[PDB]
């Protein structure tokens, strides 16, 4: 089960999938016209995993792109990698959901979910070794947070056994232009907890902070953030694809990275994170990446080690790394971070190594943790929902949608139950 499907939806998740395919074709080396350039044998296997052997040795990546605006597909077609695509690989409807999750997955989602589910069933019939389903959408926008949620629900109903990799982007608390954004986000996650089994916390503000501290960019640009998240997503799949001392699969994480099935959120962290121009001063070593992984400033979820108690952690590496070095680093961090490291495990560690060197780097590492700081974001979004729909402003829209406030209270109570599960397990 090496073949993995990728689905892209939402206003920003489309660009996320575009950057993901850019990184895919850049890792092994590939032309944007379907011309094979890898060497020698593995690259064809990863093509069969992600691409399709079209006529004349062509290769087209298996991706499902859907959004309420055809300008998005026009823009991703304007890019080099991803310009050509079979018209069945992407279906786009009209026009917009008004940044509404209920309306999005009720009206904008239901009219195209049939066609996209037929398409994905066709490709699942074509792809025999399908294991997981990477998802690239935006939780902030009501359009994405509704459409992608409905699609993940339908896939869970159709493929309960296949994995569901959800790399959605949590909303930023600083943004107060549209107050319905966190409300749609919480209504989407209240269902995605059961629709999806593997979710990754991603905050836009965390991305802004990391590009302002490392890249030192003046104004936040989605391009570099999408490049970073695409690199992170490609690392975790090349850990299994590319040969290494220990490959990691989605089932391996589902059975090890999470103790109880009600937890599906996974923090994120990437290394090395070198400032622009300081790459000459930097020397790739194990201790620096180990220090980077256990810092909230380097995380993009972004959860604080000092704030939240660690339930479990995992650090995957690429390139040539020694098992002794990572073992010593893990022992040191267990001795020093024993406060966050929970006692009932008592030693939480999950390691995976990729032998080949990363694209443009000698070694690259990713990090995932399950800490008690995600319940803080849950409390924040619940307080946002309550304080926003206490004013009863713009609630007439959702009354016209037909949703009931009992369902909203049920969603918030289920989120509080998940928080209490993350308080068992107290912080």
């Amino acid at each position: 089960m090496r073949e993995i499907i990728h689905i892209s939806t939402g206003q920003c998740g489309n660009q996320i999938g575009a950057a993901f395919w850019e990184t895919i074709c850049g890792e092994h080396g590939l032309d944007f016209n379907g011309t094979y350039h890898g060497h020698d044998d593995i690259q064809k296997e990863r093509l069969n995993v992600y691409f399709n052997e079209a006529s004349s040795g062509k290769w087209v990546p298996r991706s499902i792109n859907v959004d309420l605006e055809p300008g998005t597909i026009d823009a991703v077609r304007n890019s080099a990698i991803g310009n050509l695509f079979r018209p069945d690989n992407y279906i786009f409807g009209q026009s917009s959901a008004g940044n509404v999750w209920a309306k999005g997955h009720y009206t904008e989602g239901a009219e195209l979910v049939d066609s996209v589910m037929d398409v994905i069933r066709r490709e699942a019939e074509g792809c025999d070794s399908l294991q997981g389903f990477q998802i690239t959408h935006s939780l902030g926008g009501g359009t994405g947070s509704g459409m992608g949620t409905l699609l993940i629900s339908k896939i869970r109903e159709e493929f309960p056994d296949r994995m569901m990799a959800t790399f959605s982007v949590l909303p930023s608390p600083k943004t107060s232009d549209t107050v319905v954004e966190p409300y749609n986000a919480t209504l989407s996650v209240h269902q995605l907890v059961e629709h999806s089994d593997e979710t990754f916390c991603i905050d836009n503000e965390a991305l802004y902070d990391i590009c302002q501290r490392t890249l030192k960019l003046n104004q936040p640009s989605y391009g570099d953030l999408n490049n970073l998240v695409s690199s992170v997503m490609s690392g975790v799949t090349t850990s299994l694809r590319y040969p290494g001392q220990l490959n990691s699969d989605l089932r391996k994480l589902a059975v090890n990275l999470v103790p109880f099935p009600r937890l599906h959120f996974f923090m994120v962290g990437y290394a090395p994170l070198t400032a622009i121009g300081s790459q000459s001063f930097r020397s790739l070593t194990v201790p620096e990446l180990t220090q980077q992984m256990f810092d909230a400033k380097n995380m993009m979820a972004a959860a604080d080690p000092r704030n939240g108690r660690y339930l479990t952690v995992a650090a995957f590496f690429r390139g040539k790394v020694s098992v002794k070095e990572v073992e010593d680093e893990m022992h040191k961090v267990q001795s020093k971070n024993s406060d966050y490291f929970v006692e009932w495990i008592p030693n939480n560690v999950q390691t995976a190594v990729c032998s080949v060197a990363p694209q443009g780097l000698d070694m690259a590492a990713t990090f995932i943790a399950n800490s008690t700081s995600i319940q803080e974001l849950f409390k924040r979004v619940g307080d946002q929902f309550s304080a926003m729909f206490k004013r009863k402003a713009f609630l007439h829209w959702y009354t016209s949608e037909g949703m009931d406030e009992l369902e909203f209270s049920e969603a918030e109570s289920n989120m509080n139950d998940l928080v209490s599960e993350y308080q068992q397990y107290q912080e």
Partner: protein
């Protein structure tokens, strides 16, 4: 009856078997490609091998009869990239389409026996091809749960099939401090259950002690899994040298099996080999075999995270390879009797199964240990493995009390009574070793 069949299970087991066949071909002057090279060359024929492990074809080609089973296609591609796949027959290697689980919960399940049927009919066909069998050889690891599960299940099936031939299972034991998989305690306990089902002889080895030896004795900054596989190849070659080459003291494998088990039940003897030093240090030292024996008795040359000085003495076997002098071994046993460190059991006390192999030891050039003309291997029974099992059982009982992964297990098809019985079996083996140490 002289032939020996080897099995390669799991990723680590397949790598270990690769290193073993590499060292085998390197000792008999055979290239890893085939035809030949060269011979069947003085005395690579009779006395076998290479015809015990290397079945000779009609054209003189010597194919090693090994079965590489693993549900990971990556390991199959890896072992296919090597020239030994060309040396092997394509039917000998068994490719795994999909990995059962991470890593043991489904490996020992019905998904395991689905392919076990195929590998058993393949083994039957191979036994029809090459008649005679001295003992079943197994290579797997406890870290890779798929390897441990498939190896234990196949061992049980073949013991139910013949049961007349000995079973030698090599299992890599994880270090008590590092856990690359949090699933491994459960897997180790359930594998101890399967060994209680069937275990003729099982070899315990910890990667931590081997890496420490490479760092200290071999002066390696970062020990590689390749060096560990090479050392395992060296120790298993020294074991099988008694049957491969000629020697004044040639001991049958079944003789080893019965000597290790004077009691109604003994399954787990620890191993140790010497010398393991640096190449430059090997050029600096020209010690006799007496010092090699004195060093092998130390916990350093055990290659396992167990101290023989702590546990009590039991029936042991001392194999020697290369130039051996009777006066040397007499002085060695004299110094051993003068040591009086470990407590001797009442039945054994003056018991040391002495084996001699005229063939000088041989080491791979990739290994940092220089090839030596003399080597001593001590295989003894100790109660420190009981302490290691007790620590592992404490960890497994803590996890069982936390019942976090027991949910995933009962989702995989496991039961509470199964884990309870496996824990009972582990505690029973620990108490058994405690008692047979107390009977001394």
């Amino acid at each position: 009856m002289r032939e020996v069949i080897s099995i390669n299970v799991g990723q680590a087991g397949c790598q270990i078997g690769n290193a073993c066949w590499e060292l085998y071909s390197l000792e008999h002057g055979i290239k890893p490609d085939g035809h030949l090279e060269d011979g069947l060359s003085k005395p690579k024929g009779g006395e076998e091998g290479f015809s015990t492990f290397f079945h000779e074809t009609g054209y003189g080609k010597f194919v090693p009869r090994a079965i590489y089973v693993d549900l990971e296609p990556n390991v199959i591609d890896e072992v296919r990239n090597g020239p030994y796949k060309d040396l092997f027959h394509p039917e000998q290697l068994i490719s795994g389409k999909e990995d059962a689980a991470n890593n043991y919960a489904r490996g020992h399940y019905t998904v395991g026996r689905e392919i076990l049927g195929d590998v058993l009919d393949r083994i039957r066909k191979l036994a029809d091809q090459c008649d005679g069998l001295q003992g079943f050889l197994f290579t797997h690891s406890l870290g890779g749960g798929t390897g441990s599960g498939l190896g234990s299940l196949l061992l049980e099936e073949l013991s139910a099939e013949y049961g007349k031939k000995s079973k030698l299972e090599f299992a890599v034991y994880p270090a008590p401090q590092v856990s690359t998989s949090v699933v491994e305690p459960y897997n180790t306990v359930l594998t101890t259950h399967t060994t209680l089902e069937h275990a003729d002889c099982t070899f315990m080895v910890d990667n931590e002690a081997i890496y420490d030896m490479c760092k200290r004795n071999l002066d390696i900054p970062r020990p590689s899994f390749a060096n560990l596989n090479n050392l395992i190849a060296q120790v298993v070659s020294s074991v099988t040298a008694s049957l491969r080459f000629d020697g004044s003291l040639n001991v049958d494998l079944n003789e080893f099996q019965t000597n290790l088990v004077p009691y109604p039940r003994i399954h787990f003897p620890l191993v140790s080999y010497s010398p393991v030093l640096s190449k430059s240090k090997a050029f600096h030292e020209s010690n006799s075999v007496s010092e090699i024996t004195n060093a092998c008795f130390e916990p350093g040359n055990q290659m396992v995270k167990c101290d023989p000085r702590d546990g009590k003495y039991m029936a042991t076997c001392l194999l020697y390879r290369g130039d051996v002098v009777t006066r040397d071994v007499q002085r060695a046993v004299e110094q051993v009797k003068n040591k009086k460190t470990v407590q001797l059991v009442d039945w054994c006390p003056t018991g040391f199964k002495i084996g001699i192999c005229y063939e000088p030891p041989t080491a791979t050039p990739n290994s940092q240990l220089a090839t030596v003309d003399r080597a001593v291997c001590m295989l003894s029974n100790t109660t420190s493995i009981a302490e290691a099992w007790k620590r592992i059982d404490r960890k497994f009982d803590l996890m069982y009390a936390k019942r976090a992964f027991v949910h995933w297990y009962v989702g995989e098809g496991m039961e509470e009574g199964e884990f309870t019985e496996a824990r009972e079996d582990l505690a029973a083996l620990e108490r058994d070793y405690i008692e047979v140490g107390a009977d001394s």
